[PDB]
Amino acid sequence: KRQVASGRAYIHASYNNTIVTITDPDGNPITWSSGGVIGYKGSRKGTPYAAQLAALDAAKKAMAYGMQSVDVIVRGTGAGREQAIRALQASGLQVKSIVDDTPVPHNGCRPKKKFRKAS
């Protein structure tokens, strides 16, 4: 309970799952959803569908606190990303905008073998 009205929605998509988050302007979260949350648990957490369900849950619960305008921010390139985004949009939540903020080092820590190989 708080009545935020205007906040931001952080979407974190990964090859393995998508967690969505809705904070308030200054940055503090209000509510969040995720593949797990919505019920899928395993290889399904990643599928776009889940992301859809997740993203919509992040909204429903968000709607509670009185949210109405989010500034969707994307991170990661996981499957079902440009998908979760399409959900928040068609959720009633006026999607102020979209931004890609996937972090990327300027050559930081040696990745693990899984993702190694320089060029």
């Binding site: 994307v74 440009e82 985004i85 905008s97 979209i98 931004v99 890609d100 903020d101 300027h106």
Partner: protein, 73 residues
């Protein structure tokens, strides 16, 4: 892609070695801090090169970003 216009034409006589010329430099960066290619800036190696050495100063100084957020999408 990139068959529009080079970032050199849209501009004039300018010191490619001036590390304070923000108004001009900002023209050589994408929707991000990313320093535009040559296929984009349309410069000579010697030039394109120097440009960077210059840009990378604008950065430390504080006049120029290192990276920007991608709007749209």
């Amino acid at each position: 892609p990139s068959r529009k216009a080079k970032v050199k034409a849209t501009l004039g006589e300018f010191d490619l070695r001036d590390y304070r010329n923000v108004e001009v430099l900002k023209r050589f960066l994408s929707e991000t801090g990313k320093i535009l290619p040559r296929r984009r800036t349309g410069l000579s190696g010697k030039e394109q090169r120097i440009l960077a050495k210059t840009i990378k100063r604008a950065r430390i100084l504080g006049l120029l970003p290192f990276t920007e957020k991608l709007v749209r999408k």
